[PDB]
Amino acid sequence: HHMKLVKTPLKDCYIIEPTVFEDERGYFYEKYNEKKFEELTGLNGHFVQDNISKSSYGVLRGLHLQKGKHAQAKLVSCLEGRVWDVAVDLRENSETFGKCYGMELSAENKLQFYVPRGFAHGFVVLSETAVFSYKCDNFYNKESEGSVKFNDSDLSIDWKIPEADMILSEKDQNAPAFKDKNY
């Protein structure tokens, strides 16, 4: 019954590990519960928007964020296939400012990854195709968008797959460096 939030090296960034109940017909679990989450973290647990994408192997999207009062906390998971998901703490006041953390999200492992406001976020598709789910605690605002180049040499993120396999949009190919502070 208790929600299980697992610590990561980034402050306020958590893995939600599900408690899965199995039985004859299959399984069931409580994927998310706002009251439990807010009780455990003291953070906002009210999500207002749910987004879905399906992409093919090697598609890499990120690192993305919305600035200021438009910043979005994200609760992300993989509904089909496998992805490698990365978060970067960009809060200048945070003891983990400038640090990154990555993890595999898959339909099989049923994990969710909570990325606070003030972070940048991205992911790469590891399987033939993957369906990616992200819930946001704030609404879309194009003008507020910020970004960090995914392969910025200061962050030195390990995106796991061969570089020749990565598929990037023109925007993500041209995102400003971490030191340029487009956030």
Q: Find the binder of a copy of itself among 29, 92, 153, 173 (CB under 8 A).
A: 29
The stretch among 38-46, 60-68, 92-100, 105-113 that binds Ca ion (CB under 5 A) is 38-46
Interacting partner of 27 out of a copy of itself, Ca ion, none (Cβ under 5 to 8 A depending on kind): a copy of itself
Per the structure block, which two tokens stand in for 104? 């595999």
| Sign of the dihedral defined by the CA atoms of residues 29, 31, 37, 41, in that order | positive
Torsion of CA 165, 77, 116, 142, to 10 degrees: 70
**CA 177 remoteness from chain centre:** 19
Does 129 interact with a copy of itself (rule: CB under 8 A)? yes
Interacting partner of 28 out of Ca ion, a copy of itself, none (Cβ under 5 to 8 A depending on kind): a copy of itself
Total residues interacting with Ca ion, rule: CB under 5 A: 1
Cα distance between residue 70 and residue 165, in whole Å = 33
Cβ pair 103, 84 in contact under 8 A: yes
Chain residues binding a copy of itself by CB under 8 A are: 25-35, 46-56, 59, 79-80, 110, 129, 133, 139, 167
